[PDB]
Amino acid sequence: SVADSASSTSSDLGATFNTRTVNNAVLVGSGETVVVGGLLDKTVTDTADK
Amino acid sequence: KNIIIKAHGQTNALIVTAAPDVMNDLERVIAQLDIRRPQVLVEAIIAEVQ
């Protein structure tokens, strides 16, 4: 998709193009639920001054 | 003269119109060449602090 709340467009090409891209090969039985690809991630940051 | 192997691709089957006496040297090798293959699950993790 494209977000562009605010991004780097320098009056050139205005675009972010958020994307996730998978490709692979797998053997699978006929009627079966199959896990192909996965990602899970947290990200914390702190700022203090006194 | 020679062995002419042709492959179909539209039924995924192949032919052998070659020697009519030693084909057994082909049945054995294809039998050793058609085999289910196991697949492996890879996950990597990273983490840092700044």
Q: Is residue B18 a contact partner of residue B2, using CB atoms and an 8 Å limit?
A: yes
Report CB contact under 8 Å: A27, B36.
yes
HSE at residue B37, side-chain half, CA atoms within 13 A, is: 8
Q: Which residues of A touch B36 (CB under 8 A)?
A: 27
CB pairs < 8 Å spanning A and B = 5
Top residue of A26, A27, A39 to mutate, by most chain B CBs within 10 Å, is A27
Alpha helical stretches, state H, B1-50 = 24-31
Question: Distance between CA A10 and CA A14 in Å, rounded?
Answer: 8
Residue pair B35/B22 in contact (Cβ under 8 Å)? The answer is no
Task: Round to whole Å and give the CA distance between A24 and B38.
Answer: 14
Q: Answer for the pair A22, A36: CB distance below 8 angstroms, yes or no.
A: yes
Q: How far apart (Å, rounded) are the C-alpha atoms in residues A16 and B4?
A: 54
Spatial distance between the Cα atoms of B26 and B31, rounded to a whole number of angstroms = 8
Structural determination approach: cryo-EM
| Residues constituting chain A | 50
